[PDB]
C-alpha cells in the first residue's frame, strides 16, 4: 500500500514510489506523431510515440509538448503520457496505490479540477492529492523556513515561507523558462550561421544548452573578452559528425533570464522580483529569508548562477544583511524527494482526499482540502 | 498563448 508520486513538469515526468531517495522514471514528457503515413507491416509503425522512444526516433516524428508554462493544453496527450508512465515504466496498477501530483502556483482552477476529475474517473485511484513544487523542495532540503526559487522548464516562480506559514501576497511567478532560452539560442545561432528550426533540432539545441552554458559576473567584460579573443569559443559535435563552434552565445543566453529585455518581455529579472517579493513580507522575517534562499528545478543548474544571484541581491539589499544561497547538486529531483517525504509522513495520510469525497462533492472539493 | 486570452 506504499504511495507514489509523479511530478509532471513541462520538461520531463519524474515518477517514482515513496520512501525512496531517488526516483525511477525520469522520462521526457513529449508526444511524437509520424510525419508520413507509413507502409511497413508488422514492425512497429504505431500511430503515436511517447517517452525516450520519441527522443530516439525524432528525425521523423513531429513532437509536441502537451503542457506549456505549467498549464495543460492537450488532455489526450497528457492522459496518454500518464498511461505510459503507470503501465509501462512503473509497471503497477494505480487502483491499489494512491497518486500524489504536483502543480505550479497561480494556475487555472479549471485545469486542476480537470486533472483531478480525469485521474479519478479514468484510473479509479483511491485518493488523489496535489501540492506546490516548492514546499516539496523545501522539505527535501529539510528546512522549515526561507524562500524557494524554482525555474522549471515551463515556468519560473519564487515563494517565501516562515516556520511553515506561507505568504501568498509575496509569491511571484514568471513565464520565462528553458523553452524561451532555447528559442533565443536558436535565434542567435542563426545569427552565427547555424540554422535550427525543427523539433529534433530544438531538442539538439536544448542538449547543447544543458551541456555548455554558463554565466558570469561582468556581462559587459565577458562580451568584450569574447569579441577580442577566442578563449571562449567551444566546439560541439552533432550526430551528422560536422562539428560546430559557439562563442559568447553560451553565456549570452541566460542573460534573458537576467535581462528579459533581450527577448522582448518587459518584466524584471529573477533578482529584482525576488527582492520585491522579500520586500512585500515583514522585516523580522526578511532578515532570515535573506540568510537562507534555496534554488530548485532545472534552468538553475548553470555554473556560476550562485555568484551572479548573490552579487545582484547583495547590491540590491543593504550590506550588513548577510546572504547565503543554497544550490545543492540534487535539485533536479528535489520536488520528487519532497513529495516522497510528505507521502511517507504520518499525519499527511489524514489529508489524502479519497474517491467518495470527490464523488459526493464533485471536483470543487480540491480547492478546499488542498492549498 | 495557452491562457485563453493573453500570453
Amino acid at each position: 500500500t506504499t504511495a507514489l508520486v509523479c511530478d509532471n513538469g513541462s520538461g520531463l515526468v519524474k515518477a517514482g514510489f515513496a520512501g525512496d531517495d531517488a526516483p525511477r522514471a525520469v522520462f521526457p514528457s513529449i508526444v511524437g506523431r509520424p510525419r508520413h503515413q507509413g507502409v511497413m507491416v508488422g514492425m512497429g509503425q504505431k500511430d503515436s510515440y511517447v517517452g525516450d522512444e520519441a527522443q530516439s526516433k525524432r528525425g521523423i516524428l513531429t513532437l509536441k509538448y502537451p503542457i506549456e508554462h505549467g498549464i495543460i493544453t492537450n488532455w489526450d496527450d497528457m492522459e496518454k503520457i500518464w498511461h505510459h508512465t503507470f503501465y509501462n515504466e512503473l509497471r503497477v496498477a494505480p487502483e491499489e496505490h494512491p497518486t500524489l501530483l504536483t502543480e505550479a502556483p497561480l494556475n487555472p482552477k479549471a485545469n486542476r479540477e480537470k486533472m483531478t476529475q480525469i485521474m479519478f474517473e479514468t484510473f479509479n485511484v483511491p485518493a488523489m492529492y496535489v501540492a506546490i513544487q516548492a514546499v516539496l523542495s523545501l522539505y527535501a532540503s529539510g528546512r522549515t523556513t526561507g524562500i524557494v526559487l524554482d525555474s522549471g522548464d515551463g515556468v519560473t516562480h519564487n515563494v517565501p515561507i516562515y516556520e511553515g506559514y506561507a505568504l501568498p501576497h509575496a509569491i511571484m511567478r514568471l513565464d520565462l523558462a528553458g523553452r524561451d532560452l532555447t528559442d533565443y539560442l536558436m535565434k542567435i545561432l542563426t545569427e552565427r550561421g547555424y540554422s535550427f528550426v525543427t523539433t529534433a533540432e530544438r531538442e539538439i539545441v536544448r542538449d547543447i544548452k544543458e551541456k555548455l552554458c554558463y554565466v558570469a559576473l561582468d556581462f559587459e567584460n565577458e562580451m568584450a573578452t569574447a569579441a577580442s579573443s577566442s578563449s571562449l569559443e567551444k566546439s560541439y559535435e552533432l550526430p551528422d559528425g560536422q562539428v560546430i563552434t559557439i562563442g559568447n552565445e553560451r553565456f549570452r543566453c541566460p542573460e534573458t533570464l537576467f535581462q528579459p529585455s533581450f527577448i522582448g518581455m518587459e518584466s524584471a529579472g529573477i533578482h529584482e522580483t525576488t527582492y520585491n517579493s522579500i520586500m512585500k513580507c515583514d522585516i523580522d522575517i526578511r532578515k532570515d529569508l535573506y540568510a537562507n534562499n534555496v534554488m530548485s528545478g532545472g534552468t538553475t543548474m548553470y555554473p556560476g548562477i550562485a555568484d551572479r544571484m548573490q552579487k545582484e541581491i547583495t547590491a540590491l539589499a543593504p550590506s550588513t544583511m548577510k546572504i547565503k544561497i543554497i544550490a545543492p547538486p540534487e535539485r533536479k529531483y528535489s520536488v520528487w524527494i519532497g513529495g516522497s517525504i510528505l507521502a511517507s509522513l504520518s499525519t499527511f495520510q489524514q489529508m489524502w482526499i479519497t474517491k467518495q469525497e470527490y464523488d459526493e462533492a464533485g471536483p470543487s472539493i480540491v480547492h478546499r482540502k488542498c492549498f | 498563448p495557452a491562457w485563453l486570452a493573453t500570453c
Binding site: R35, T62, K187, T190, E191, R192, G193, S195, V197, T198, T199, I263, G264 | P1, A5, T6
Partner: protein, 364 residues
C-alpha cells in the same frame, strides 16, 4: 550626385537611382563572364540560392558588370544602400560591405531590411509585412513607426522549392526536365499557369471529375506538355511545407502565431494592415485564401465554435500591382530621405578602425 539603389535578390537583381518609382533596370543574377542580361552557353551558377551568398567572387563579377555595363559610374564616395533578409548571418553582410568598401569607395551604405523598405514604399507606419521572395520569405510587424525585432519570422520555403516540386510532379506525370536548362521555362510556365485554391476540396473534386483545368503549354524546343492538378497544387506545397519535407506550420498559422505573440493592443492594428512583397506573392487567389485561412484559424483557436461574433473581426489585407518592386521603391525613398545627413550612414572612413563593429550600429 544622388545615391544608388541595389536590392540584391535571390535570383533577380534590380537597380536604379535614389529617386525612381519604377526600377530602371532588372535582370536575373544567373551566371569571359556572362553576368548580366546576356543569359538570353557557358556555365550556370545561380550563386544566391537563398539569402546567403556562396560564390562571392561571382557576386563581385556581377556587381562589376552592373556598375560598368548597365550603369556607367565607377565612383568612390557615392552612397549606395542595400537589402538583405532579417536574420541573414552577419558574415554575408560583412563580406558585402568589405568588398564594396575595398573594390570601391561607396562611403556610406546603411544596409536595411526588405520588410521596412516595402513598408516605406507603401507609405505606412504600422502593420505586418510578409515578403515572399524566391529562396526565402520573412514576416515583420511594426506599430506606430516602431519595429519589434523579437517577433520577426523567417521561413526558408518559397519560389525555388515550389519550382522543384512542380518539376517532381511533371516527372511523376512522365515529362522530365532533368537538364540544367528549361528551369527558366518551368519558372515561366509556373508564373503563367498557377493559382491558389480558395477551396482545396472543391478544386480536387473538379480536377478529378472534369476535363477542364487541364492546359497545354508549348516549349521553346517545339514540343508541348499537359498540366493539371499541379497548377492548383504548387500553392498548396507553398502552404503546406510538410508536403515539401520541412516541419513548419505554414504561412497563415505562422503569421497568426507571430501576431498572437505580440500585445493585444497591437493585434487589431495588425489585422487591419497586412502588406505583401515579392513575385512569389502574386499567385492568383493568395490574398483572399490567406484571409479566409486567418478567419478560420481565429474561429477555431479563440471562439472554439461560436460564430455569433465572428463578423466583428475587421481583417483588411492589402495588395497592389507593385509588390514586385516594393522593396526597390522603399530603398529609393529611404535613400532620397537620408541623402542629406551622412552620419546615419557608414562612411568609407571609420572602417579599418572598427568597420565590422560599425555594422552593429544598425541592429543592436
Amino acid at each position: 550626385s544622388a545615391p544608388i539603389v541595389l536590392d540584391n535578390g535571390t535570383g533577380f537583381v534590380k537597380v536604379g537611382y535614389a529617386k525612381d518609382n519604377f526600377p530602371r533596370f532588372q535582370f536575373p543574377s544567373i551566371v569571359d563572364v556572362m553576368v548580366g542580361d546576356e543569359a538570353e552557353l557557358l556555365q550556370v551558377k545561380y550563386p544566391m540560392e537563398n539569402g546567403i551568398i556562396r560564390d562571392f567572387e561571382e557576386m563581385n563579377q556581377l556587381w562589376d558588370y552592373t556598375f560598368f555595363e548597365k550603369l556607367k559610374i565607377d565612383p568612390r564616395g557615392r552612397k549606395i544602400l542595400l537589402t538583405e533578409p532579417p536574420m541573414n548571418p552577419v558574415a554575408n553582410r560583412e563580406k558585402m560591405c568589405e568588398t564594396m568598401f575595398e573594390r570601391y569607395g561607396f562611403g556610406g551604405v546603411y544596409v536595411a531590411i526588405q520588410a521596412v523598405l516595402s513598408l516605406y514604399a507603401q507609405g505606412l507606419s504600422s502593420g505586418v509585412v510578409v515578403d515572399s521572395g524566391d529562396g526565402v520569405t520573412h514576416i515583420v510587424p511594426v506599430y506606430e513607426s516602431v519595429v519589434l525585432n523579437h517577433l520577426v519570422g523567417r521561413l526558408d520555403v518559397a519560389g525555388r522549392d515550389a519550382t522543384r516540386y512542380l518539376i517532381s510532379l511533371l516527372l511523376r506525370k512522365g515529362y522530365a526536365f532533368n537538364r540544367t536548362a528549361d528551369f527558366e521555362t518551368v519558372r515561366e510556365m509556373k508564373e503563367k499557369l498557377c493559382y491558389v485554391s480558395y477551396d482545396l476540396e472543391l478544386d480536387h473534386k473538379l480536377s478529378e471529375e472534369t476535363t477542364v483545368l487541364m492546359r497545354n503549354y508549348t516549349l521553346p524546343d517545339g514540343r508541348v506538355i499537359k498540366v493539371g492538378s499541379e497548377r492548383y497544387e504548387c500553392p498548396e506545397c507553398l502552404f503546406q511545407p510538410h508536403l515539401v519535407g520541412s516541419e513548419q506550420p505554414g504561412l497563415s498559422e505562422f503569421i497568426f502565431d507571430t501576431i498572437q505573440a505580440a500585445d493585444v493592443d497591437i493585434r487589431k492594428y495588425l489585422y487591419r494592415a497586412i502588406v505583401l512583397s515579392g513575385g512569389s506573392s502574386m499567385y492568383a487567389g493568395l490574398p483572399s485564401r490567406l484571409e479566409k485561412e486567418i478567419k478560420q484559424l481565429w474561429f477555431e483557436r479563440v471562439l472554439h465554435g461560436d460564430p455569433a461574433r465572428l463578423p466583428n473581426f475587421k481583417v483588411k489585407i492589402e495588395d497592389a500591382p507593385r509588390r514586385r518592386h516594393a522593396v526597390f521603391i522603399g530603398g529609393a525613398v529611404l535613400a532620397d530621405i537620408m541623402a542629406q545627413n551622412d552620419h546615419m550612414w557608414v562612411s568609407k572612413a571609420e572602417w579599418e578602425e572598427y568597420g565590422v563593429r560599425a555594422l552593429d550600429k544598425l541592429g543592436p
